[PDB]
Ligand binder design. Structure first.
Ligand SMILES: OC[C@H]1OC=C(O)[C@@H]1O
Ligand SMILES: OC[C@H]1OC=C(O)[C@@H]1O
Ligand SMILES: O=c1cc[nH]c(=O)[nH]1
Ligand SMILES: O=c1cc[nH]c(=O)[nH]1
Lengths: 293, 290
């Protein structure tokens, strides 16, 4: 069996209209069950153009392809959204707050639509620690800059923390899917999530920096010793909010560089373009597998 | 004054790749592209920032193709006309912080001088009429302190988030000259979440009451806060650190004491969003007349 999407907010049922402002969708203008009722896989990532390329790629893999892929979030440019069969693809911009806004409105969307048995997967990019560039990491545990699996949020002025573990069975399944493709290195490790790409990640190439190469190396190697294999900027809220609503979720990111060797992203454009298809291919394999059952 | 960085590592680099702009010192001529920039205007939405650069062109008599300088990426958009640069920054502290780091280095590479940085945005008001414009006197955290906190190599650091006082008063005068919409100077609270982070009852998560919301928002008002958004604190912190003259100008889309949902008709909201554009348009026109 597969359970209905639940909220942790009793106010929503008591509203006569729910406006999904950042999607330009509303319960009074759109039929959510008709539009989204059959959704089973929701994939999210930073870049709208990557999330569109993803929907097209998955359409081909599941035999839906010919055709046009309309942006469901016409009426806004905050996020883009696409659908083919049971697969929904949504962009989320960059950063904890940007993906958090998307998650609130998306979980409400799935709830209004009465979706059931859903899986949510982030596909993204990151910096690796001690891994060859282009390696894919499947996140076991999302982790803060001090290495603790917690997400802190200020609510009405008070600090609140939620656990940021991810579903273990899902990560092992994702690892098997990657083994089946046999196309690129894929590890499971912890993922550090930060609020800043530059100083927040120990970079020396920001507009501000008051530390040395030695300080960076020491911090990064300490992170590695604590089991961290990559660094990005969304994993923490994603995990916390999915945990909060009882949703099975996973995070799959390609590394664009090895941070023990540098800060700048200088690989040729063709190499980066291909690196970024790796998570798509992995998740594509996962979805195809699930559908042949 | 020339734009300055607080990072000694930059000077010794062979090339500087501005990854999220898809710009690089070795593929792009920064002095030739941006050397004459004096006014940098930043906002969340790529559409709004494009409309802004068009509006500005007309008001300064440049008016008709306006190329996205950041073709090659879709992370941010960027437009230029004369001494005015229009840049989008997405939503949230980390999104605008990535943008700022790279924008400030860009201005340094172009060796721009006497620049002004202004965020034109949207926000939720507290105790103000929807459509009111707020000029940020001081950016403040969700406990109403003028501090921005960042974790660097695992350690907590804080910077002050005051904004240039002569600039806020100059902007107030520009709005008075327009005479088109209510404009107040007040404090602006910056949060890391739009829903629970701002005391909304309409998120996917909410374990508090309408009454809890009211008393939090009213305490905020009592501490001099007039609007709520998601960028002001880092913006002020980084500009302060680099010695840049900066301001924050946001229209209010609703009064949060009356509600959480943004339910005004599309046409009203579009007109609201032009208000900060027009004010900043006034400011630029005057700086250029003098
Ligand atoms: O360029 C930074 C983006 O890549 C991975 C993330 O988590 C950020 O959104
Ligand atoms: O819709 C939320 C956006 O409006 C103002 C901000 O600061 C956010 O980026
Ligand atoms: O080093 C990196 C690369 C991509 N995304 C990140 O957040 N960090
Ligand atoms: O209420 C609001 C409206 C726009 N932007 C915000 O951060 N809050």
């Amino acid at each position: 069996h597969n359970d209905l999407v639940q909220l942790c907010n009793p106010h929503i049922a008591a509203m006569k209209e729910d406006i999904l402002y950042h999607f330009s969708l509303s319960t009074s203008t759109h039929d959510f069950p008709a539009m989204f009722g059959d959704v089973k896989f929701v994939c999210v990532g930073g870049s709208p153009s990557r999330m569109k390329a993803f929907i097209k790629y998955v359409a081909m893999e599941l035999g839906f392809a010919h055709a046009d892929y309309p942006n469901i979030c016409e009426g806004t440019d905050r996020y883009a959204m696409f659908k083919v069969g049971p697969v929904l693809s949504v962009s989320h911009g960059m950063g904890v707050p940007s993906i958090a806004i998307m998650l609130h409105e998306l979980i409400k969307l799935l709830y209004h639509a009465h979706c059931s048995g859903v899986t949510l997967i982030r596909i993204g990019t990151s910096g690796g620690i001690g891994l060859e560039p282009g390696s894919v990491v499947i996140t076991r545990q999302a982790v803060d800059p001090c290495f603790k699996p917690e997400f802190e949020q200020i609510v009405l002025g008070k600090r609140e923390v939620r656990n940021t573990d991810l579903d273990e069975q899902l990560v092992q399944e994702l690892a098997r899917c990657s083994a089946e493709l046999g196309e690129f290195p894929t590890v499971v490790g912890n993922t550090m999530c930060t609020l800043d790409f530059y100083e927040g990640q120990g970079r020396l190439d920001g507009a501000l920096c008051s530390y040395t190469e030695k300080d960076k190396q020491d911090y990064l190697r300490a992170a590695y010793a604590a089991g961290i294999r990559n660094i990005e900027m969304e994993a923490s809220v994603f995990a916390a909010m999915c945990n909060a609503c009882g949703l099975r979720a996973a995070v799959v990111c390609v590394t664009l560089l090895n941070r023990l060797e540098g800060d700048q992203i200088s690989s040729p454009h063709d190499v980066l373009a291909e690196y970024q298809q790796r998570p798509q291919r992995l998740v594509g394999q996962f979805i195809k597998k699930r559908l042949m059952q």
